[PDB]
Amino acid sequence: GSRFHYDRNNIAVGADESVVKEAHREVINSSTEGLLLNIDKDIRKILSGYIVEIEDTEGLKEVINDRYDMLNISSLRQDGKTFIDFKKYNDKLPLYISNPNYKVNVYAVTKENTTSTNGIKKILIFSKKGYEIG
Amino acid sequence: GSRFHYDRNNIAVGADESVVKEAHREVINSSTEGLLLNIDKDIRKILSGYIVEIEDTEGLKEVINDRYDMLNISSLRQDGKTFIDFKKYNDKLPLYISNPNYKVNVYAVTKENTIINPSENGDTSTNGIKKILIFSKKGYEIG
């Protein structure tokens, strides 16, 4: 099979979940400001961005960057590493995690899956409890 | 009161300046290549690293390792002592102190005060980082 999904002009616009999931498996650093990781350029090119969501112990979810045009929250450091920035669309503040058992879920959105983010098809690429984040 | 400052996970991430300074007070060797000293593991754990600065007689200051991602100049050597390496981000050379009255200042940066990622303005400097002076000696006081 092929690692990526291609559109009708053979431009890569997506990938199966397992592929996207595996590409984000190496986290260098996590904190309430965001995630630092190495992401392959060819993976970066198939994504429109990321959705950031806090989930409480009752399973209730809150999307922090909750509009279709607030998905662009990752950028590259001078050294090539990717920072997915929780603060950018959170009033430039770190995430507030009120209980260490709350979860921070980050989802990747592929270009073929791109006002709200509900209804956006997305790929869970990071999920940790507050006590497991910096 | 409490020796350390604790984060939302009840992990120590800082402390009052008096505690940090006191934990670095006793230096085994100071040279232009850096500082050798014993630091308590529990203090090491609350630090992101150190900023090294040369300060002339007129008070003009030069930070040697000036970036948010260059604080990591400390390590444990074979005997468990900490060595704060002045060469690491100094083009791999020892500090050049032009005049023996000039100072070398070293500041510690605690985890709660560290800069994890550059600002949205794209600033990668330590200017403005909150930091704690833990060593300040003139050239003639330095090996």
Side-chain angles (χ1 to χ4, degrees), chain A residues 1-21 23-134, chain B residues 1-119 122-143:
Chain A
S2 90
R3 264 225 308 167
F4 295 115
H5 302 174
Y6 296 83
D7 74 7
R8 74 190 62 186
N9 304 106
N10 295 300
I11 306 213
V13 290
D16 286 356
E17 292 192 56
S18 44
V19 172
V20 172
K21 289 173 189 292
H24 290 83
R25 270 219 297 94
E26 309 145 13
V27 186
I28 303 339
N29 186 253
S30 68
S31 76
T32 55
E33 290 193 12
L35 310 177
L36 181 78
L37 18 40
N38 295 308
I39 299 170
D40 171 2
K41 68 190 166 46
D42 284 1
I43 293 296
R44 166 172 232 74
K45 288 195 299 213
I46 59 159
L47 299 178
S48 48
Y50 295 91
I51 292 157
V52 181
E53 168 197 273
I54 286 161
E55 178 183 5
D56 67 31
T57 42
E58 301 294 315
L60 302 192
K61 294 152 161 183
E62 172 192 1
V63 173
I64 299 311
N65 63 326
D66 192 14
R67 308 185 47 216
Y68 71 98
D69 53 355
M70 301 163 82
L71 306 170
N72 44 303
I73 61 166
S74 75
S75 53
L76 277 355
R77 314 264 265 221
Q78 299 176 346
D79 68 4
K81 285 188 217 43
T82 300
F83 188 68
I84 296 174
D85 180 7
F86 302 164
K87 309 179 59 195
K88 188 174 190 184
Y89 292 121
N90 190 51
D91 304 294
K92 35 264 276 144
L93 292 167
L95 291 199
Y96 177 59
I97 302 164
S98 81
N99 185 295
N101 296 294
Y102 285 18
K103 284 187 193 147
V104 180
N105 303 139
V106 185
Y107 305 81
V109 182
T110 61
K111 303 201 170 146
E112 67 174 338
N113 286 151
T114 305
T115 65
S116 99
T117 67
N118 253 267
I120 287 177
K121 184 186 164 52
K122 58 191 195 293
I123 302 173
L124 179 72
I125 57 86
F126 173 87
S127 184
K128 296 296 201 204
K129 285 160 159 310
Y131 77 84
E132 297 174 294
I133 295 176
Chain B
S2 147
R3 183 171 191 223
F4 301 123
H5 308 167
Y6 288 88
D7 69 10
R8 65 182 198 271
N9 291 322
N10 289 324
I11 299 309
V13 288
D16 291 355
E17 295 205 2
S18 54
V19 171
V20 180
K21 290 166 168 336
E22 174 72 24
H24 297 70
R25 178 186 36 96
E26 176 173 341
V27 180
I28 302 318
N29 185 17
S30 80
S31 82
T32 53
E33 335 229 327
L35 314 179
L36 191 73
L37 69 173
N38 277 311
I39 303 160
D40 168 10
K41 66 186 168 62
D42 283 359
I43 291 287
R44 301 198 269 98
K45 310 185 32 77
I46 64 163
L47 302 179
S48 55
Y50 297 93
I51 289 173
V52 183
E53 173 189 80
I54 292 160
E55 173 175 1
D56 71 26
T57 50
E58 298 69 51
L60 299 182
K61 279 159 191 172
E62 184 189 346
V63 171
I64 297 313
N65 55 318
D66 181 20
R67 292 179 47 109
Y68 77 100
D69 61 359
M70 302 187 150
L71 303 182
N72 61 140
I73 63 168
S74 68
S75 60
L76 266 15
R77 54 173 223 175
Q78 185 200 82
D79 68 359
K81 295 171 175 74
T82 297
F83 180 71
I84 300 178
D85 188 350
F86 293 169
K87 305 178 15 162
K88 188 172 173 169
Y89 300 123
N90 185 43
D91 300 314
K92 315 160 157 71
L93 295 165
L95 299 182
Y96 171 68
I97 311 187
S98 49
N99 172 322
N101 285 315
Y102 287 10
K103 285 194 189 193
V104 176
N105 299 325
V106 184
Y107 308 78
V109 174
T110 62
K111 281 183 174 156
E112 60 182 355
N113 284 145
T114 306
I115 293 174
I116 292 169
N117 262 92
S119 75
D123 188 351
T124 56
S125 89
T126 73
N127 294 157
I129 309 223
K130 196 165 148 213
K131 65 188 191 299
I132 311 176
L133 177 71
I134 56 88
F135 177 95
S136 186
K137 286 293 192 318
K138 289 181 169 62
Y140 58 83
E141 304 174 313
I142 292 184

